[PDB]
Design a protein around this ligand. Structure first.
Ligand code: HEM
Ligand SMILES: COc1ccccc1O
Length: 403
């Protein structure tokens, strides 16, 4: 509809999945709020627009169309008002910093050592599948009460939910262009129900210290639990992004450090720099790149665009974190970048609830990795490809080291 942006009509879903950064560089210069036809939605590409939409009193949360098709109702990311307040009160106890500090080290550190012990003397590894993803899912899986779900299965589930959630391509009529792309999401959810329904059955009668047991019981009148249909969409929110993103974040941080070998040596020599390295890694390739959204609740003007009430806006935080209004040469990883606010955890009432936990999982994992393999080198015989528009990270990270 907007004549000067007619080139957007030719942007494809595959191009956004393989490398969204070229199109979004144009968006940030040309139209910080722009309707992208293949996504069927306005997209916010700059830091100022993302932060304004995420915190505006005239916007509320909405799930993207493919996200809603995947999660249903009431996903914590997609609801507001009393339901959102309840779901936030449900998830927040185990994520409170003082609580996380009581047990996070005893949780993640033995998990990291267990996965490292399987390959640390091989001289070669593919760190995404052998380390980053397993540590991420095994840590959260144990916290949740899914100790008996193998890390292979948790990784499979978040990959299928990822592809379903981000199956966003639409045709000229706004209809999903890839309707068969939700089937593996439905298949994953069916498997999850078969595993988790008996656990919920048991937790209702015998509560324990698992997070999902507390989701059922916390804050309820005596003898009542939250209905499982009411909590399952937030279980799915966890089984996608909460399982996937810490692994994405540590892997992207490592890829960034490899691209600056002198900074990798700095961080290995001084592991107190690991949190700073992770924060730059999240800015450099944001794990949640363009997954979440808001919807206007009244007519509003954003970036010169007069939006009617009921207008969805996708928050492309991964693009906002390359805003050259904030950063110099943002496409380069730089451990010594002047620390600034970033949007990798979002903003507003629907900002990430698990920031403190996630940073600790990533930090401890990198601590243990650099301790066990101080001479880690990237396998330059292999290249690192990143994939994903909604959620983005490296598909593999081949490394070598002298044994
Ligand atoms: C590096 C890892 C992670 C990153 C980069 C990340 C980032 C994000 C982002 C961008 C959002 C959407 C915010 C918005 O729309 O403004 C979000 C939401 C959320 N995240 Fe995180 N996340 C990570 C890990 C986790 C973990 C491990 C958990 C749970 C233990 C978690 C729990 C949540 C929840 C519950 C929400 C929904 C909040 C709401 O809608 O009220 N996240 N996260
Ligand atoms: C924390 O997990 C999510 C965040 C935003 C969208 C989907 C998710 O599963």
């Amino acid at each position: 509809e907007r004549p000067d942006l007619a080139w957007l009509d030719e942007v494809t879903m595959t191009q956004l999945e393989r490398n969204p950064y070229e199109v979004y560089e144009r968006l940030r210069a040309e139209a910080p709020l722009a309707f992208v036809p293949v996504l069927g939605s306005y997209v916010a590409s700059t830091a100022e627009v993302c932060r304004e939409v995420a915190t505006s009193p005239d916007f509320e949360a909405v799930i993207t169309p493919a996200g809603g098709r995947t999660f249903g109702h009431p996903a914590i990311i997609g609801v507001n008002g009393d339901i959102h307040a309840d779901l936030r009160s449900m998830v927040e106890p185990a994520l409170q910093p003082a609580e996380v500090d009581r047990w996070i080290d005893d949780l993640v550190r033995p998990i990291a050592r267990r996965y490292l012990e399987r390959f640390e003397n091989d001289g070669h590894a593919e760190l995404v599948a052998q380390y980053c993803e397993p540590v991420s899912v095994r840590s959260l899986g144990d916290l949740l009460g899914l100790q008996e779900v193998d890390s292979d299965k948790l990784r499979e589930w978040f990959a299928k939910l990822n592809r379903s959630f981000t199956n966003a391509a639409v045709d000229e009529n706004g209809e999903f262009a890839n309707p068969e792309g939700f089937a593996e999401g439905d298949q994953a959810k069916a498997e999850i129900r078969a595993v988790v329904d008996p656990l919920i059955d048991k937790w209702i009668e015998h509560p324990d210290d698992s997070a999902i047991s507390h989701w059922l019981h916390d804050g309820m009148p005596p003898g009542q639990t939250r209905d499982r249909e009411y909590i399952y969409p937030t279980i799915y929110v966890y089984l996608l992004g909460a399982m996937q993103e810490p692994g994405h974040g540590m892997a992207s941080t490592l890829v960034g450090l490899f691209s600056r070998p002198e900074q990798l040596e700095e961080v290995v020599d001084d592991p107190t720099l690991i949190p700073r390295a992770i924060a730059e890694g999240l800015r450099w390739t944001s794990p949640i790149w363009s997954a979440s959204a808001r919807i206007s609740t009244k007519p509003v003007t954003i970036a010169g665009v007069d939006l009617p009430a009921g207008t969805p806006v996708m928050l492309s935080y991964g693009s906002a974190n390359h805003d050259t209004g904030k950063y110099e040469a943002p496409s380069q990883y730089d451990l010594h970048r002047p620390p600034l606010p970033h949007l990798a955890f979002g903003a507003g009432n629907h900002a990430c609830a698990g920031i403190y936990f996630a940073n600790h999982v990533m930090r401890i994992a990198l601590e243990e990795l650099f301790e066990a393999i101080p001479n880690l080198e990237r396998d330059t015989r292999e290249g690192v490809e990143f994939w994903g528009w909604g959620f983005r990270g490296p598909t593999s990270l081949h490394v070598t080291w002298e044994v």
